[PDB]
Amino acid sequence: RNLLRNPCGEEDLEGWSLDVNGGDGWKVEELSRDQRKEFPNDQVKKYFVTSYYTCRKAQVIDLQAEGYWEELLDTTQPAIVVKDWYSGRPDCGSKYQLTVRLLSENEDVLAEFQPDPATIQQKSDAKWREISHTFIDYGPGVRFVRFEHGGVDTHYWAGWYGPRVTNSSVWVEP
Amino acid sequence: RNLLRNPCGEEDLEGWSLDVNGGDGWKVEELSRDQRKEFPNDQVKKYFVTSYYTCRKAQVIDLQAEGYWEELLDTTQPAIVVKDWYSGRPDCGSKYQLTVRLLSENEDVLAEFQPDPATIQQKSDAKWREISHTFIDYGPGVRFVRFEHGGVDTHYWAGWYGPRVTNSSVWVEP
Secondary structure (H helix, E strand, O other), X not given: OOOOOOOOOOOOOOOOEEOOOHHHHEEEEEOOHHHHOOOOOOOOOEXXXXXXOOOEEEEEEEOOOOOOOHHXXXXXXXXXXXXXXXXXXXXEOEEEEEEEEEEOOOOOEEEEEOOOOEEEOOOOOOOOEEEEEEEOOOOOOOOXXXXXXXXXXXXXXXXXXXXXXXXXXXXXXO | OOOOOOOOOOOOOOOOEEOOOHHHHEEEXXXXXXXXXXXXXXXXXXXXXXOOOOOEXXXXXXXOOXXXXXXXXXXXXXXXXXXXXXXXXXXXXXXXXXXXXXXOOOOOEEEEEOOOOEEEOOOOOOOOEEEEEEEOOOOOOOOEEEEEEEOOOOOOOOOOEOOEEEEEEEEEOO
């Protein structure tokens, strides 16, 4: 049970918080039948593409609102697994970055998955990549999951397109 | 092919670099038959246990020395997969921290996986957990991989002991 709203763009841009570029920073497209082969299920049929290399978008999940009460979290600590799929485009290099945080009730960063940026080298095609992380043993107080991704916000145009993203998920393990 | 030597203590502490505590910081024990069922390959039979809550140990993998050549590293950037297993002990709190770096020829940190500390809550048992990370799209220039793990080096005793560790690996995906 994926706790992120609108993982692939089926509701267009709804459910996502946009950066300064707003609506103009993003487009939703259909995957070629070929690209559909690259995902676990055959339920991934769309994707988001940044219009400009710095574009990011974000969502915050309220765990209590999703059925995960205070005490299950503090006491049981179930695995929270976060995944994303990103790619470049056919013919040049993209940059991508993902930030996922586990937040307390007053928004302290209690845990953080912020891997280095991904540099997607240029190629005739644009294979999808997955990125995955599981939080366990994360401690008491976890209430929100903030999930943010897109291009690398930098003052410096150095060649690199923004990424394509789709199939974002967050879930709590049984 | 796992590029870490001695991932389980079959060779005692050989191949590992020890912290200030050297050898008194570590013991190798045999897993009970029940504890061996928690691992995939039936070939994990020992583990490492910290003698003090701060003890760490590390290895540095030279990737050219392992057959991974410059052009493969700089242009293909094949997935570098890193895994570790850790637990506590029955009835106390343990704390654990893993630090994995990709390094250039000069030891510049090109990519780093340093997840927040794991707080292993106290419990009747000591179930192993696995931690796993894949490095892809990490850019050119990677030559060494440093793998460090153990308890949390803090000056302050808070009751939290160090962990047990085993079956550590780093491999390069075909």
